Design a protein around this ligand. Structure first.
Ligand SMILES: Nc1ncnc2c1ncn2[C@@H]1O[C@H](COP(=O)(O)OP(=O)(O)OP(=O)(O)O)[C@@H](O)[C@H]1O
Lengths: 219, 194
């Protein structure tokens, strides 16, 4: 069926059918995440080291988390989620422990995917990292990512609002080197989104979703 | 109480200087939980402020937690270490005793100090001599207290008795005591008593 599959076919029930209007970026993230994990033999045969980090960004509400969760569920790999706020709400000295745990658990269950949602809230711009705790957490994250090179079949995905909001040290070789940009959709994309969302509403007979898609620009 | 292996080990403790200053103003009471001590209220005589007990967490950070209902008493203790003198015979003890004449008010058991026990314990040595034997029978803390309570010997006689029983130089004092009139009356009545 679908997703390793009424039996064969609430954030673990999202697939590629719940996303519309982002074919290009979806293809990029898929070819960057699935192939290293689903088919690691290609890279062994061709003798290359696939990049690990992936950094998505775009305006809020563009479905970054939706895409990450959909890719994780479709790949069928051990998925570990890290939220910037909830990591940064822990008592002093516990955020680093949470990061170390997350990464150790991900490593021990390879293949795995680590999704750091809203990474700009735990590794913000170096100017905004005013405080001992901010520096300690940023350093812990950098150490964990640097020490992951030995780890294999583990991919880290980070989502941020803008490229200039995270610490510049996270955008180097051996770190979030690949980048993806999500933009507002076009008329076809908006029509697809409308069809996705209004697939359960009791729409009246006189609905012109095409007209709505035409009228709704910048949404 | 007994150690982890099932023995009769002994432990020594001492309460801190703030627990000592906390109980004086009441402010503490025992709780149904053995390890935790309760806290009293702000009555019209005793005024109890908010009590915080400070602890350090596993991350090396001190954390203050309000404990009005009850707090552990481990913050009100300091632990000492006990021991016994090395087997090397230093003999700095004040008494070669603690095995003999019955102790203090143990009337519940058969240990009842009385003239018969003296007649059976401290009379054969006083009827023979062997001043060393008499000295090692006379150096019992509880025996000294008992004979003092008997009040047969006058204060000076008892002072020379204690200094004969506790001082490393006792020959002359022991001879003076055994020759003293008070001791002679004591031993005579003890012999006559049955
Ligand atoms: N194609 C689509 N693109 C974007 N959002 C979509 C799409 N289809 C449905 N949605 C809905 O739009 C909302 C997107 O919210 P989402 O949390 O994914 O965005 P985000 O701001 O990028 O995420 P986050 O703050 O968690 O990183 C969700 O309701 C999702 O169900």
């Amino acid at each position: 069926g679908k997703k390793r599959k009424n039996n064969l076919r609430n954030m673990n029930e999202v697939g590629y059918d719940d996303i519309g209007g982002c074919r290009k970026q979806m293809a990029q993230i898929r070819e960057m995440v699935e192939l290293p994990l689903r088919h690691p033999q290609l890279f062994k045969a061709i003798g290359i080291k696939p990049p690990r980090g992936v950094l998505m960004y775009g305006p809020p509400g563009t479905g970054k988390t939706l895409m990450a969760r959909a890719v994780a569920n479709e790949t069928g790999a051990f998925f570990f989620l890290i939220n910037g706020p909830e990591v940064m709400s822990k008592m002093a000295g516990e955020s680093e422990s949470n990061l170390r745990k997350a990464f150790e658990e991900a490593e021990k269950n390879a293949p795995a995917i680590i999704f750091i949602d809203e990474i700009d809230s735990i590794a913000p711009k170096r100017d905004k990292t005013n405080g001992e705790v901010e520096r300690r957490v940023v350093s812990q994250l950098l150490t964990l990512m640097d020490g992951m090179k030995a780890r294999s079949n583990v991919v880290v995905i980070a989502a941020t609002n803008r490229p200039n909001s995270i610490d510049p040290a996270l955008r180097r070789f051996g770190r979030f080197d690949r980048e993806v940009d999500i933009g507002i959709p076009d008329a076809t994309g908006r029509l697809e989104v409308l069809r996705i969302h209004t697939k359960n509403m009791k729409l009246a007979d006189d609905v012109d979703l095409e007209a709505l898609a035409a009228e709704t620009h910048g949404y | 109480s007994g150690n982890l292996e099932g023995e009769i080990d002994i432990s020594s403790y001492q309460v801190s200087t703030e627990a000592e200053a906390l109980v004086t103003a009441d402010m503490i009471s025992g709780s149904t939980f053995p390890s935790m001590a309760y806290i009293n209220d702000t009555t019209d005589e005793r005024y109890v402020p908010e009590i915080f007990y400070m602890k350090s967490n596993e991350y090396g950070i001190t954390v203050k937690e309000n404990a009005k209902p009850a707090f552990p008493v481990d913050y009100l203790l300091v632990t000492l270490t006990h021991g016994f003198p090395n087997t090397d015979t230093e003999t700095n003890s004040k008494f070669v005793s603690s095995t003999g004449f019955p102790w203090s008010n143990r009337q519940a058991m058969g240990q009842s100090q009385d003239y018969q026990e003296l007649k059976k314990y401290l009379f054969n040595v006083a009827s023979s001599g062997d001043f060393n034997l008499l000295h090692e029978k006379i150096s019992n803390f509880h025996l000294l207290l008992y004979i003092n309570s008997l009040q047969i010997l006058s204060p000076d006689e008892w002072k020379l008795l204690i200094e004969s029983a506790v001082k490393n130089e006792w020959e002359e004092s022991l001879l003076k005591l055994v020759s003293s009139a008070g001791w002679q009356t004591l031993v005579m009545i003890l012999q006559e008593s049955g």
